[PDB]
Amino acid sequence: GTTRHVYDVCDCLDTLAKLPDDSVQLIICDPPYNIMLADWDDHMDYIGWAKRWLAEAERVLSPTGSIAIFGGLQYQGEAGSGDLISIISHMRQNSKMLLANLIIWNYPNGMSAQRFFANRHEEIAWFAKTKKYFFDLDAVREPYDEETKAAYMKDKRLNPESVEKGRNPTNVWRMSRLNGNSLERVGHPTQKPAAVIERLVRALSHPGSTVLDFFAGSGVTARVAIQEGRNSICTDAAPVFKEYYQKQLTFLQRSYEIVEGAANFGAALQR
Ligand SMILES: Nc1ncnc2c1ncn2[C@@H]1O[C@H](C[C@@H](N)CC[C@H](N)C(=O)O)[C@@H](O)[C@H]1O
Ligand SMILES: [Cl-]
Ligand SMILES: [Cl-]
Question: Do 175 and 196 touch, CB atoms closer than 8 A?
């Protein structure tokens, strides 16, 4: 099964406007949480701008599709900025999508703090377009060691199948962020680790389906999509994105094709 991956440098709304209704299965969304100076010509707050791509994201998702939105809960009230709560509140008022889960990404290390509890978490809001969203839990279950699995297998009160399939990873993920000495590092300041994206891709999309990322950043989504047998469309407004994408590809070096240019999005939409 050969997959196709398209990438390009452009604004998220320009990408979305080029995608047809219900054509995407999963969207990875790790958006900037502040608007640009020029954005003050048409908006009075962050959501004023964000609601545009949020509405479009929903439009391009298929009936069984989902969108995972990364964000924090530390917004301080600055004009033009916001956080995951700004988005969730907007979604509750204006979207029919369902909040299937609020995932806590609990990372091991971080900065210290003397006047408050040191921050060790970031959130992921998983929104499903409808109640018929796709979910592959078995694909992300965590297996028990042979010792524990044996102990449970003897407990007649427990379902043997559930035991062998492994445990639900829960909505709290203890995963490390990338460090400056990380191998998959490409130079992007807010680069996300492949491990977190793999879990979302494996559980929220089916093989051969399209994964879209319009705030692609380091291009980690394409690398994960290729490795996992999915098709992908990754775009970012920064020209340096093309540099990161090509860097992600070297980490791979399986049948897949890479295509540059928004005019070629269709190559990755074909099922
Ligand atoms: N209008 C836009 N269209 C497409 N990409 C954008 C736009 N504005 C910003 N970006 C890109 O989106 C990414 C935002 C990330 N830094 C977001 C990480 C994280 N949510 C944070 O803000 O800390 C970057 O790679 C930006 O180049
Ligand atoms: Cl939840
Ligand atoms: Cl990234």
Answer: yes
- Whole-number Å distance, alpha carbon 115 to ligand 3 midpoint, is 30
State the residue for tokens 């099922």: 271
CB 257 within 8 A of CB 3: yes
Contacts of 220 (CB under 8 A, 6+ apart): 184, 191, 192, 193, 194, 197, 248
Closest CA to 126 of 207, 190, 178, 201: 201
The token pair at 78 is: 């600055």
Instruction: Give strand pairing partners of 211.
Output: 26, 232
Neighbours of 170 (CB within 10 A): 11
The CA distances from residue 32 to 77, 116, 245, in Å, are: 15, 25, 19
At which residue do the structure tokens 């407004």 appear?
237
Rounded CA-CA distance 177/190 in Å is 10
Residues 25, 31, 37, 40, Cα dihedral to 10°: 60
**Count of helix runs (H) and strand runs (E) in the chain:** 9, 9
The experimental technique behind this entry is X-ray
Please tell me if the CB atom of residue 213 comes closer than 6 angstroms to any atom of ligand 1: no
Q: Which domains does the chain have, with CATH numbers?
A: 1-271 (3.40.50.150)
Residues with Cβ < 8 Å from 243, sequence gap 6 or more?
A: 186, 187
Residue 219 CA to ligand 3 center (angstroms) comes to 6
Nearest residue (by CA) to ligand 1, atom 27, is 238
Q: What is the resolution of this structure in A?
A: 1.9
216: left (phi over 0), alpha (psi -120 to 50) or beta: alpha
